Amino acid sequence: PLEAQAWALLEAVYDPELGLDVVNLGLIYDLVVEPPRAYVRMTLTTPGCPLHDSLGEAVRQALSRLPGVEEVEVEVTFEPPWTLARLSEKA
Amino acid sequence: PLEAQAWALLEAVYDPELGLDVVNLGLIYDLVVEPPRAYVRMTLTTPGCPLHDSLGEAVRQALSRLPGVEEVEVEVTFEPPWTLARLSEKA
Helix, strand or coil: HHHHCCCCCCHHEEECCCCCCCCCCCCEEEEEECCCCEEECCCCCCCCCCCHHHHHHHHHHHHCHHHHHHCCCCCEEECCCCCCHHCCCCC | CHHHHHHHCCCCCCCCCCCCCCCCCCCCCEEEECCEEEEEEEECCCCCCCCCCHHHHHHHHHHHCCCCCCCEEEECCCCCCCCCHCCCCCC
């Protein structure tokens, strides 16, 4: 139940450079919600670590909206590296 | 607006070895058009850096045709490495 709610929350988190949400952009690589923990592995649309990972922060915030989730681990990785081929049909 | 125009321009940029355009070939990994800047991350069909990156140059030229784009950054990468699995249905 929380898994579906989690996806809806992420679908509302938008990436400024592409004007699309992180889910339809294909940036979410793994998502596990098991109270009191939530884990998400995601990537960014361009290589390199930004000075402020605001997108990762937005994803963390969204997941924290879930009831009973006291710890949200957001791991940002470039493996595998992202490309537009990961866009969903809707995107 | 410019995003759709950008794609059309790239769809007219052809790769000699395969006889197909860079878009349907799946060589474009990321595309961001935000005047006065345009950024594109792409790859080539074979490993290695060529003496003259003619295809990369053709992509840069195509994007420069967009109104208000005074700077076009074309990044050529091999991550992830390209294969024919990236061809579009049309291709």
